[PDB]
Amino acid sequence: DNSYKMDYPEMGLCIIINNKNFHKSTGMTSRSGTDVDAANLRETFRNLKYEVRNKNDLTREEIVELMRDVSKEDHSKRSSFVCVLLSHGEEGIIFGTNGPVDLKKITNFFRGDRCRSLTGKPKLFIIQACRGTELDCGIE
Amino acid sequence: DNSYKMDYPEMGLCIIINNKNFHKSTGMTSRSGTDVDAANLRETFRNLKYEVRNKNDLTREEIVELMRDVSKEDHSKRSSFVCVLLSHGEEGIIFGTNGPVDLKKITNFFRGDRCRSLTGKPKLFIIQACRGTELDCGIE
Amino acid sequence: KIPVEADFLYAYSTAPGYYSWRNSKDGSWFIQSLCAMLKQYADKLEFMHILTRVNRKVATEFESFSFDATFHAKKQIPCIVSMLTKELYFY
Amino acid sequence: KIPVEADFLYAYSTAPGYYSWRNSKDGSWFIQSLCAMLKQYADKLEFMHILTRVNRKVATEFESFSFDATFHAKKQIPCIVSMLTKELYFY
Numbered sequence: 001d002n003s004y005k006m007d008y009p010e011m012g013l014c015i016i017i018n019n020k021n022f023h024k025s026t027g028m029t030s031r032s033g034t035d036v037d038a039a040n041l042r043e044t045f046r047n048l049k050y051e052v053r054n055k056n057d058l059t060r061e062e063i064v065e066l067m068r069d070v071s072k073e074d075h076s077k078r079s080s081f082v083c084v085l086l087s088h089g090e091e092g093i094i095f096g097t098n099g100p101v102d103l104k105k106i107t108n109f110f111r112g113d114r115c116r117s118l119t120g121k122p123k124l125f126i127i128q129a130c131r132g133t134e135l136d137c138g139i140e
Numbered sequence: 141d142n143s144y145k146m147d148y149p150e151m152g153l154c155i156i157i158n159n160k161n162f163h164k165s166t167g168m169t170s171r172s173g174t175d176v177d178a179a180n181l182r183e184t185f186r187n188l189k190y191e192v193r194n195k196n197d198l199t200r201e202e203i204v205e206l207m208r209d210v211s212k213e214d215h216s217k218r219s220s221f222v223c224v225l226l227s228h229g230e231e232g233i234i235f236g237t238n239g240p241v242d243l244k245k246i247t248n249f250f251r252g253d254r255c256r257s258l259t260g261k262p263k264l265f266i267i268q269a270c271r272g273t274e275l276d277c278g279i280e
Numbered sequence: 281k282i283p284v285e286a287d288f289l290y291a292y293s294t295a296p297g298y299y300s301w302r303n304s305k306d307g308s309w310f311i312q313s314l315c316a317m318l319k320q321y322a323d324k325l326e327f328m329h330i331l332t333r334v335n336r337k338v339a340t341e342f343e344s345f346s347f348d349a350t351f352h353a354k355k356q357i358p359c360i361v362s363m364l365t366k367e368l369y370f371y
Numbered sequence: 372k373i374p375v376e377a378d379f380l381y382a383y384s385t386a387p388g389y390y391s392w393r394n395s396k397d398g399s400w401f402i403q404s405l406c407a408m409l410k411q412y413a414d415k416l417e418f419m420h421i422l423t424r425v426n427r428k429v430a431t432e433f434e435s436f437s438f439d440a441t442f443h444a445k446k447q448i449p450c451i452v453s454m455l456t457k458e459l460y461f462y
């Protein structure tokens with residue numbers, strides 16, 4: 001067998017964290033249009049049979065709190081886990097509405113030893129966020 | 141068309157940089173067994189029809205000098221480019237025999253605008269080198 | 281016994297250290313391309329191959345426009361980071 | 372016009388920030404697994420799927436042994452970083 005077992009009772013969870021409005025003190029501009037991505041993602045993963053949960057404008061705290069809580073759920077009957085992060089960011093970092101959250105921190109909640117209900121199952125992270133400021137001028 | 145054109149006259153180059161012995165001042169231990177990887181890689185890519193060139197124990201300088209020179213060659217009749225780096229290293233870095241060389245630096249020689257003969261062709265980099273010191277204790 | 285870092289897949293909207301484009305009304309280049317490729321290929325392709333489609337699309341069909349020379353005519357390539365252990369199919 | 376960072380594939384022997392094992396006589400876990408999977412699948416599979424095979428192999432069949440408790444019983448997952456625009460076949 002070389003393909004993941006996706007025949008469990010349910011496809012799994014699809015957490016979409018859509019941060020559009022940030023705290024003035026962060027100096028982050030609103031991410032206009034991200035609502036479109038959120039709706040789209042929601043519709044698409046809905047049709048892929050995932051249980052979708054949209055969370056909007058979460059603070060860095062709420063983001064961790066959320067991932068902690070999601071990782072502590074029982075995914076025994078689920079096939080996979082999908083987490084979509086829509087926000088500002090930099091290499092290894094995504095912004096909560098009030099500050100940054102390093103990716104590693106919210107990803108460790110789902111690693112083998114921490115989330116045993118997902119062990120051996122595909123953990124997918126889709127991230128729409130800058131990884132820095134370099135620009136690609138293309139060629140040809 | 142959704143697959144890379146691999147029917148060019150030749151499969152391409154396969155540069156294998158095998159660093160086993162480092163300068164005492166670096167404090168890097170010899171990478172015993174790497175010679176096995178070098179031979180293996182050489183045999184394997186030979187059978188895949190790539191022109192293989194093995195370079196052993198290159199200094200950081202020689203590594204850049206090498207990549208510069210390889211990028212300046214004409215790859216018009218080649219399908220792809222493969223570069224194998226066997227050495228010590230850390231995140232975004234691989235060690236020449238006398239010091240480190242950040243990956244970005246030797247990779248830029250092959251990007252779209254710099255190496256026009258490889259534009260639109262697969263540029264593969266296989267790296268056997270640590271990306272840090274964290275250890276995976278596994279689970280189950 | 282398997283690695284704790286195993287079975288992870290990070291699908292970045294852009295390459296390391298790079299900027300990531302978003303259209304005020306169409307959404308982010310990466311997301312709208314992703315959703316689009318899932319719709320047409322979820323029932324026909326392995327996930328890696330779908331993302332590759334996403335890459336070619338974002339790389340091919342998008343190019344920034346700005347009155348600001350610095351941000352004008354820019355491109356973007358998504359980045360697939362797989363530590364997956366098997367082929368993934370949504371069916 | 373395409374991204375200058377496009378059509379790149381970085382096949383890391385290990386995950387980001389992690390150590391990478393090498394056997395004094397068998398070679399590095401990643402390389403010996405890579406070569407092995409190329410031999411059996413170069414003529415049958417797309418490159419991404421071959422590397423995935425490499426991942427499962429290294430993740431499954433290898434486990435460090437050391438008299439040094441700190442390095443004993445460790446695992447390793449390779450990391451595939453694709454910015455490829457098409458499916459790659461060696462035939």
Ligand SMILES: *C(=O)[C@H](CC(=O)O)NC(=O)c1cncc(Br)c1
Nearest residue numbers: 031088089128129130300301302
């Ligand atoms: C950088 O972190 C973000 C990522 C995102 O918003 O998804 N990008 C921008 O701030 C940005 C993207 N596209 C156009 C403009 Br103007 C700004």
Ligand SMILES: *C(=O)[C@H](CC(=O)O)NC(=O)c1cncc(Br)c1
Nearest residue numbers: 171228229268269270391392393
């Ligand atoms: C860390 O950069 C290197 C990478 C390599 O040599 O390919 N790894 C070691 O130094 C190492 C690997 N496996 C066992 C021992 Br002991 C040391």
